[PDB]
Design a protein around this ligand. Structure first.
Ligand SMILES: CCCCCN1[C@H](CC(=O)NC)[C@H](O)[C@H](O)[C@H]1CO
Ligand SMILES: [Cl-]
Length: 677
């Protein structure tokens, strides 16, 4: 499956052997990076002049002057041809030639090419990735892998802007990178150039920028240092700030100053891009005039970024129309997927979909803001590349499958399995959701409704569920030990562990359903409980970031199914045997029996908290030093806070409330406790 799919393709049923003897036409004049890919692919082959002609060059070269009528007249376009007589690789420009070779390399199979003619070019001028997230910035090694990936998928744009790089954002945006980091960025730029990617260095100065000479000069001096490191494209971001830095006239004046004194003075600056403060429609205040002020004042060559109708949204026709009218140019899309920096306990490994496929003329650019997990982001990045290049032929599902097969050929089916059940975000403040476990979600829902009602579940539904849990176990175990993409496996391992437990738990719960004696049922019940404890353990020891710590997997369909099935079948056992098995579905070492009630406790880092729900005594599992207690809202009944180690003698605590390291085991109140580790 050629990816991205070319604009125009005609294939003949005819194999052509990659020629034992070739004559290279235009090797000396075509894009050096293209030529280098070609020599690699023709290794162990006789170059001679008693050989099949290989014509490579850009439009204007002598080597390809025959084919000027065939070469699309678009930036980054190319003509490619293979037949028994000769091979032609002719870009409209140097990048076009490089892109002909990326398609060519995909056509090569066993040492044999199809007889084919291709005319190709992108529908969107700028295509790629913005490293624009909160969290651990991508490692240097990850970035070098990214750039190679982008070259292979004809993404021409990489915008460097990790929110948490102190030399990118406030206050050290003012400071040059130190030597080590600088040397690394120099390397990134060279590798980007070799892979035909524009390295766009962004700066994020808005939270503390002063609209004076001194800060304008420092910004320009920083840009100058980046230029000395090889950077030839630049961005200024004003996203997620408050204060004077949000002033549109000042932002526009700054960017036009950079444009006229820097970008237009240098011989060789490409992209100049800004991210507005109102970067989506929901954040745009119609009582003011912010967007129309940028649109009217910002020089027109400068790009203006946009995430859609909301912070996290997919791009529609009416949406891009709405923004474009206001900024008086086509928006450069900043698509906030698969970025997971607000749901950091989930991986987002599903297909890329929802963006209108007919609106390519209406965008200046399209870039994705990915997860801090670089390798795992390649599923979405690969797909965005395909979409951006040829949106008219964008095939959501096939592209996803092709991405996975590219990233992990040794275990693509195992990755598909893992990815299909790790795609939803779960509940979040943005309300953005993705499908998950779509394949099995009707059989899951029929089974559970029937089981609950005391009707006979369809056998086939039961078996689908069994198969699913089995496949999940196989996929988890295989993925853990795969050495083809070690950095991918490092990224996902905690979730792979949790995923395997989820599957084991599912199996044991199905045996509880099927179970036909008391003793066997009890063994399975005990096992489920222990598995819940293992999941808690992984949730408390992996991915312990400050915002959404821990590891959630298969959340949309499968964990609910298992939980509700367990709860239900425990209820039926208890009725049947007049027993009192606990039907809780998540392990909790602490207890909270209490008035006013059914809310689970959660542990997050060194906090113990009552689940907030939409419409009071905690006992911990030990004595710990207390830090504080914070409480909020949601309540009718007309309250008095205390603390204890034995739940006999109680110290009242005032009110937020500090605990001053006093020993705590019990908290009472007729909601979060922090304790010391
Ligand atoms: C309440 C506001 C949430 C911030 C949303 N954005 C940020 C800014 C942005 O969208 N820039 C265009 C970061 O880029 C981040 O990664 C992404 C998703 O959380
Ligand atoms: Cl189904």
């Amino acid at each position: 499956s050629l990816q991205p799919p070319p604009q125009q393709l005609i294939v003949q049923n005819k194999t052509i052997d990659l020629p034992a003897v070739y004559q290279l036409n235009g090797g000396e004049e075509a894009n050096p990076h293209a030529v280098k890919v070609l020599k690699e692919l023709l290794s162990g082959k006789q170059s001679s002049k008693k050989g099949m002609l290989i014509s490579i060059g850009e439009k204007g070269d002598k080597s390809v002057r025959k084919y000027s009528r065939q070469i699309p007249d678009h930036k980054e376009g190319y003509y490619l041809s293979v037949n028994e007589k000769e091979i032609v690789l002719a870009g409209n420009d140097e990048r076009g030639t490089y892109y002909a070779l990326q398609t060519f390399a995909q056509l090569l199979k066993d040492g044999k090419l199809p007889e084919v003619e291709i005319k190709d070019y992108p529908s969107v001028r700028y295509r790629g990735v913005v490293e624009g997230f909160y969290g651990t910035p991508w490692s240097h090694q990850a970035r070098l892998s990214q750039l190679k990936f982008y070259g292979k998928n004809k993404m021409n744009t990489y915008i460097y802007g990790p929110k948490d790089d102190p030399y990118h954002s406030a206050p050290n945006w003012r400071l040059p990178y130190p030597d080590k980091e600088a040397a690394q960025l120099q390397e990134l730029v060279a590798v980007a150039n070799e892979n035909e990617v524009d390295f766009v260095w962004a700066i994020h100065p808005g939270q503390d920028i002063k609209w004076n000479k001194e800060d304008r000069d420092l910004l320009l001096a920083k840009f100058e240092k980046m230029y000395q490191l090889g950077v030839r494209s630049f961005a200024v971001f004003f996203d997620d700030i408050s204060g004077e830095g949000t002033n549109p006239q000042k932002q526009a004046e700054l960017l036009n100053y950079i444009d006229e004194k820097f970008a237009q003075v240098k011989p060789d600056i490409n992209q100049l891009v800004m991210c507005p403060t109102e970067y989506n429609k929901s954040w745009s205040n119609p009582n003011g005039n912010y967007l129309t002020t940028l649109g009217d004042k910002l020089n027109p060559s400068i790009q203006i970024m946009w995430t859609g109708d909301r912070v996290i949204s997919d791009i529609t026709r009416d949406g891009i129309s709405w923004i474009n009218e206001r900024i008086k140019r086509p928006a450069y899309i900043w698509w906030n997927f698969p970025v997971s920096d607000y749901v950091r306990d989930h991986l987002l490994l599903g297909p890329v979909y929802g963006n209108d496929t007919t609106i390519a003329k209406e965008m200046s650019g399209f870039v994705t803001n990915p997860m801090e997990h670089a390798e795992s982001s390649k599923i979405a990045i690969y797909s965005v590349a395909s979409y951006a290049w040829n949106p008219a032929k964008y095939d959501t599902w096939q592209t996803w499958k092709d991405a996975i097969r590219t990233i992990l050929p040794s275990a693509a089916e195992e990755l598909e399995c893992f990815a299909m059940h790790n795609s939803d975000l779960g509940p979040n403040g943005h309300g953005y959701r993705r499908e998950e476990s779509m394949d099995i979600q009707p059989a899951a829902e029929r089974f559970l409704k029937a089981f609950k009602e005391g009707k006979n579940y369809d056998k086939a539904d039961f078996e689908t569920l069994q198969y699913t849990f089995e496949r999940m176990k196989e996929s988890a175990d295989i993925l853990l030990m795969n050495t083809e993409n070690k950095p991918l496996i490092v990224e996902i391992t905690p979730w792979v562990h949790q995923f395997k437990l989820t599957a084991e738990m599912g199996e044991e719960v199905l045996k509880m359903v099927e179970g036909r004696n008391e003793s066997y049922f009890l063994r399975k019940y005990n096992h489920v409980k222990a598995l819940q404890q293992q999941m808690f353990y992984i949730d408390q020891t992996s991915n312990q970031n400050p915002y959404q710590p821990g590891v959630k997997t298969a959340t949309r369909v499968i964990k609910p199914l298992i939980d509700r099935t367990f709860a239900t079948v425990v209820k039926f056992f208890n009725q049947k045997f007049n027993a009192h098995l606990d039907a809780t579905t998540d392990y909790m070492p602490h207890k909270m029996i209490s008035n006013v009630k059914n809310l689970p406790l959660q542990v997050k880092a060194n906090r113990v908290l009552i689940s907030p729900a939409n419409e009071v005594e905690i006992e911990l599992d030990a004595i710990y030093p207390g830090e504080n207690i914070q409480i909020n809202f949601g309540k009718d009944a007309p309250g008095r806070l205390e603390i204890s180690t034995d739940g006999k003698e109680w110290k009242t605590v005032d009110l937020s409330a500090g605990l001053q390291k006093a020993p705590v085991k019990f908290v009472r109140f007729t909601f979060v406790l922090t304790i010391e580790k």
